[model samples]
Target: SEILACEPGGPPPHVPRRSKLVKSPAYGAFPVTKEPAVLSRHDRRTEADVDQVAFSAAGGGDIDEPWPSLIPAVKLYFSRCNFPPLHTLTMLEAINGTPLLDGIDMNQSAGYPWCLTLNRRSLFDVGEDGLYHPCPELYQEIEACLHNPDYFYTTFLKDELRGVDKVAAAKTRLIEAAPIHAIIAGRMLFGGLFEAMHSQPGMYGSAVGCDPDYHWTPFYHSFLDYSEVWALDYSNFDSTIPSVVFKLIGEELAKIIQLPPSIPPDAVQKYVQSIYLSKHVFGDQWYIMKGGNPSCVGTSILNSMVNNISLLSAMLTHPDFDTSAWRILCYGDDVLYATVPSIHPSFIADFYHSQTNYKVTPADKASTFPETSSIHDVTFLKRHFVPDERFPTYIHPVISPETYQQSVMWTRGGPFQDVITSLCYLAHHAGPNNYQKWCDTVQAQCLKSGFEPIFIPYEVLQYRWLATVMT
Candidate 1:
């Protein structure tokens, strides 16, 4: 029998309970945001104005294969970086790394590949004035109370859309390979942040020191959920559209995108994250902008998705409904977290109970939410799962939080750090016994510390602090 039991009862006061799975009123068309403030800062659904570019890409023929143009569109999207750079380089890596991803399936996996979604803002621009400024593919989130008050609270913390000098609207414009790159970039970026956070004070040239209250997840969400269209329309769309459409779309997009077969599955998994980031309706403070307002770009993206579902459906060769759902939660001021939100319970309880899994190299887990596991562990599981009665089939790890997080985080400078360090030691030296000796040294260090230290990939960790400082 499938072993199952609820995680230890008594969630922290801040933690929401698992029993309260509020069904999205319509499935895919759920509410994006709640508001009582003025129209200037209120939450509203806006539609994407599909004009010539869209029409041209559609080509209006018999629509034999709409997937071919997707790659070109993504290429064009990345070409316009003004101030911050897009992970086009990383995107290319994710695409090329597919073969290396093994068990990770870009076509149906929850998390694998990662990519960066740069949100560029002009220097010195503050929020209230900047709120409706139309930062391309980005949003400005602040606390509700700070909407029209305070200078620091109202100022845009990170500038998005300044990369190549061109700015796009904070409206949803679905891209083909979003999930793949975003996931890969997420871990890389997070790994970097984790490394920088743990490094000896002032060691690795961080541009800006992390604030004691700063959480990397929220900033990452600020970027990912910008103009999120997925969660906003999940209820209506899920009910109306057949799951066949998503599968067809995924299959077709995969065919046209010439990523390498060796790419790890973690790299491609970010595409779903890209959509979920925008669609899932995170509660207050889960994701706020410079001013105290619900970061509604995520709300905006959902609105755009609802409006364009027809276009997306028509483009998808077939009609298929999404199998799993997505959910999000905020743990602390600095962290905004999420999971598939697919309401599968057994896994949730299991995930929470398994928090102390020795398989996880403890030293690494100690860094992020793991440190606050007493408060966050259950919440993390809940965000990703619901009662199993809601989902019939054995989705297993398709929506399993640990499966994805582990695969991605492991390669991203967790317990895996020692391997790289040992290899480097041998590469620098020359002798038959040198490699063995280097391995012995690493092993000794691990035994002495009683845990392997997490190491962020040098470049990715560097970017998080560098990006923050540059802004």
Candidate 2:
């Protein structure tokens, strides 16, 4: 009672419906760098131009021609994205069976009640007597995570006497100022479940929240499946998520946007449309929903999967680029592909980044693993790839701080006990060789929740930990 006040017993909590706003198309500028960059239609071609053929190719070209630069392929990819046939059926069935949002009450229904996220550092649940049963504390830093509602005015509420709590006078509250490590720790918690929930089967060969093992998903399978002379190379990238969809991509995005056929057209359309409505209220001040809703990763990954595939497809179709033993796979922006003497990966990276709208994070990453000392080099899924001496093509992944940096990045989850399940799930993937790769992603498990993190499919973690209240 002296430190923090506990709420007296009362009715259960109620979650609000997902909010929607009439957001307009947004516009943003492409970055200008000394590195190779894409040229505009008005500019004359120069030797420095990244895609050497864009200027000439833009004119009088057939749609089927090899794409001169990345933007055109990006444009086309944005227009169409595919879903796996079997998974689409599964997704539709799941959608129909459980109404994602029970909209009986607008101010009391979250669209994703079934979604799982562990808000607490350890596992916990409700008791038979309407009490929250929390698990034992696992570590010093393992505290319950929270979702901060960044307030905004939106034209000072724009005369809509909506359901927000009213105030006779504005009051102030404390905001914790966190360090970079703490900030990193903050994102590490509550980052994946919502995104993985949809992306797991929504996109083909998709592996956002799938088992981290190489042989797992169809996407990762391509990396380890080939045991012959072929080599596996990968690339890692990070982007501001909603910053990605937050910008002008929204310009034509929702308008021309199409969700996987697994979803009911209009219903899914409205969700994506509102996903673009990424904003919030803060005390009289204004700020955008920067990273967007955490699930925006689902949106981000779908766009990138389509984006990279289309560009690569265009290049393969071009006579200039030769196709060897190479196929690129992606879990959102983090990509894994093959590089033989026929095509250098740098050229591919350059072409891929030519799309002005996308923001592919530039360096500050170290390649802890380099293949054949030079020719085979890839930093994939935040793990460095060091080729084995005797078997150069057989690469083992090593995690450095940067890997944790990427893996533990930003947003959402369940309260206490449910989180225990997710953290336990996180540890299960921690070991293809787990010890050194003990990413802070679940640094919580070692202390108190040490179960064999083997074979617990993400489906169980997600389903088991899922929670909601006051139906």
Best candidate (score: lDDT): 2
Please report, as a residue range, the 10-residue window in candidate 1 with the lowest summed lDDT. Answer: 149-158
Model 1 stretches astray by more than 4 angstroms? 1-88, 91-242, 260-262, 265-471
Q: Each candidate's TM vs. the true structure?
A: 0.19, 0.38
TM-score between model 2 and native: 0.38
Cα lDDT computed for each candidate against the true fold: 0.24, 0.31
Distance from true position, residue 418, model 2, in Å? 12
Model 1, 200-261: lDDT tens digits are: 21111111232311222332233232222111111112122222222233333333333334
Report lDDT (Cα) of residue 78, candidate 1: 23
Off by over 4 Å in 2: 1-205, 214-221, 224-271, 280-297, 300-319, 322-325, 339-342, 352-364, 367-377, 384-398, 401-471
Please write out the lDDT profile of model 2 over residues 1-471, one tens digit for every residue: 001112222222222212122111100111111111222212222323222231121112112122344344445443444312221212212211222211011121121111122333223344575433334431112222112211111111111111111111111111111111122122222122223333343233344544343323233335553331112322212212223333333333334433354333343233333333333222222233322222233444444554455435435534456344444545555555443434443444454455322233322233322223221233445444444344344333444442222222211222333433333444433333452244233343422334222334544433432211001
